[PDB]
Design a protein around this nucleic acid. Structure first.
Lengths: 53, 51
RNA sequence: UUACUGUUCCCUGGGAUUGGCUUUGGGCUUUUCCUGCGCAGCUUAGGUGGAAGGCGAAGAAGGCCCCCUUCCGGGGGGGCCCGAGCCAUCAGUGAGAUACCACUCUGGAAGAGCUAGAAUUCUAACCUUGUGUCAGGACCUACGGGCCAAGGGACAUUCUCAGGUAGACAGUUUCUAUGGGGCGUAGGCCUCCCAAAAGGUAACGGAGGCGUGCAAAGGUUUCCUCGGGCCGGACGGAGAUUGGCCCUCGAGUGCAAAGGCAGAAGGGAGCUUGACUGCAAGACCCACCCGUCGAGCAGGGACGAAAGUCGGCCUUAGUGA
RNA sequence: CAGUGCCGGAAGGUCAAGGAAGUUGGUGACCUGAUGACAGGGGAGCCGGCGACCGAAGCCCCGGUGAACGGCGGCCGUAACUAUAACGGUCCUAAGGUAGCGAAAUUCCUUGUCGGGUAAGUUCCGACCCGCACGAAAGGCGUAACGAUCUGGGCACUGUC
RNA sequence: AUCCCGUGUGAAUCAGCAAGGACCACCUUGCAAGGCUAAAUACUCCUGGGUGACCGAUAGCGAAGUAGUACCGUGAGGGA
RNA sequence: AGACAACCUGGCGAACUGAAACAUCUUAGUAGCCAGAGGAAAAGAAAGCAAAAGCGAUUCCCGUAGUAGCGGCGAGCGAA
């Protein structure tokens, strides 16, 4: 019935799957929370950091 | 089998004085179809009230 | 309890906690190539448009052969050989040049995307485990904290919706008459008797029917009227078609009975839909709710030359707020 | 193993929420004709309804399963005197009571017939059998021992009489 | 319709948004998801003042003297 | 941090009953139990009501109205 968020991110260290610290692949919500944010292996796309870095 | 069946006029939905469908139910059709000239419709006379 | 309605336990699907891949294939996509024997013919005419030059040495016509499709008519096509052409209103044809273009529809193939489906898969959260690990002034082989372990693995667990589902559990019902109750029968309408010469009348008092049928068995204008005896004529028979005498309406009238009806309400013909709309004084019945008849008027008709009859059916059952 | 239960299948059918191609309806900028009185069709968008197809278990369906719920049939004929039927025919179910026991804590009729016991016993024991309606783990049949058990006859002992 | 809640998706903000009993337009009112606030108001185991067409000894409080007493119940509790 | 007569707010919340039975409904969100607090509490300053006319935070009494309405359109409930 329903799909869940597919949330943009930006990286902090190379991904063995999608990109080497540059790409913006909208990973998944069930993925940013554990591997990406626990392991500090990603940063969420804040509109604040974008236009200042 | 004596199923009911209603008869009907010549509709012509209009903006005239209240003109309107005029059903007259009747019975007995165990045959082929039967129309009849039941009358005194909205318009005064009538003929061939079918179905 | 296989009575009614439900709850809980349990089972399954949808959503949430919920993630990595990398594939198989279902439904949309978007870019990559063949597809065509209406007949007049240069001849297997693809529709619709731009439409006077494309296509060539980043190397054609032609013949030598390979492959695939096939209606063995030919079509797409690799290789080599070849080396200065295959081309347009040039006319046919509803529609044009294989010069060429965008594609494209006739359908068909694949790497590209959504959401699923399935499959295995690992690791980050989840469940589970640990004599293991260190300690706080002491241990925590006193449950437990952090830590790494080891299994399991996005399944399970929980939360919500949905289908199924144990009387395990709950909330309730299960009629009355009934010459005691139960068993049996009965429960509404119509007709005859009991019903006592208006009406009405009771009993598990005695006889029966109904829960319809008919486009005609309705409506009109007409005509004649049955039966059961006897006599005639072959089978024909006790009883079937055909002519003559008694008759009380003993025949019938769709279905029960009573009352009715033989100028018929009995039977048959002619045309037809009045088995219409708006109604209605007054009556009958009358606990109420119901129910029944109705002169007469207006419209618009049928039949009938006219008078007149016709808003269902010989009347009472065929129906329920 | 017919019905039910349970288990295993689940190929096909019915199969909920939900998902969903479409389709439909209202509202509606602007549009259009007439005596008088007002409609109609209608961009967008916003709100609705119906919905092809998809949607698991369940059930239907198919097999196993009775120390799982339970069930175990009648009528009509013939044999060597007459009879009773060793044996046959018919509808039937899923099949038609096996072994044992039997008028039995189950037999109504019924103090059933017969034998023993008694002077006389509807009680009692042993048999027969037409088991109204016994019967195999709601077990069948029988058992030595045991019973403040129910039941029949004894000897001794007595105011029970 | 408004009004608060469980599950999941999950807007805009003033050339906006909510309400005006589905919904859609136009108009009118009010503008959410932060908080606080006196009075008029209901009450009596009670205290003070007053009143009684209220009782006056099985009535009035159950109770006009050691009355929740004696007594009864294990206990809650009953109760002269 | 314990106590409380009644009044109040919150959470959980029955049943006998009425419907001449009874499962929707009604007794009723009453009783009771738990949790707070006050002399009062709760509510409250407008995303309100209205209706081409106006109001202006709450809370109570009168009255509209036993009307509108809801309802096995039954018993009954009953606003503004």
């Amino acid at each position: 019935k329903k799909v869940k968020k597919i949330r943009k991110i930006i990286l902090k260290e190379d991904i063995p799957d999608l990109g080497k610290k540059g790409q913006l692949l909208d990973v998944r919500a069930g993925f940013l929370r554990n591997f990406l944010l626990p392991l500090g292996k990603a940063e969420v796309v804040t509109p604040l950091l974008l236009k200042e870095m | 089998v004596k199923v009911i069946l209603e008869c009907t006029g010549c509709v012509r939905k209009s903006v005239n004085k209240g003109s309107r469908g005029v059903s007259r139910y009747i019975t007995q059709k165990n045959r082929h179809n039967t129309p009849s000239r039941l009358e005194l419709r909205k318009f005064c006379p009538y003929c061939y009230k079918h179905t």
